[PDB]
Amino acid sequence: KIAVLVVIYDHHQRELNQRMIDIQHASGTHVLCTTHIHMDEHNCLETIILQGNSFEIQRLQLEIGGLRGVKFAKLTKAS
């Protein structure tokens, strides 16, 4: 399975990027790459693309989805 996680987060939350990076390096999944754009002055949008088993993918969204300053983390899956 390949998946894409879309994350919207607070631009002013300090150290949040670091945490998100720690998580993705610790992850059992294979993260192919991430892309970041400013939506505006307050919010960044992030696309994380990944391959792995659905269990390891789910844990990634939960770990990320729970951080403070994360507005949301939405998963899309394909076969």
Binding site for Ni ion (CB under 5 A): 38, 44
Q: Distance between CA atoms of 56 and 46, rounded to whole angstroms? A: 19
The amino acid at 59: R
Q: Kindly state whether residue 10 participates in binding Mg ion, applying the rule CB under 5 A.
A: yes
Stretch of 13-21, 22-30, 68-76 lying at the interface with a second copy (CB under 8 A) = 68-76
60 interface partner picked from Ni ion, a second copy, Mg ion, none, CB below 5 to 8 A per type = none
Consult the annotation and say whether 38 binds a ligand: yes
Q: Kindly state whether residue 63 participates in binding Mg ion, applying the rule CB under 5 A.
A: no
Q: Distance between CA atoms of 75 and 52, rounded to whole angstroms? A: 13
The amino acid at 34: T
Burial of 15 (0-12, 13-18, 19+ CB in 10 A): exposed
Binding test (CB under 8 A) with a second copy, winner from 14, 18, 25, 33: 33
Q: Which residues of this chain interact with Mg ion, rule CB under 5 A?
A: 10, 12, 42
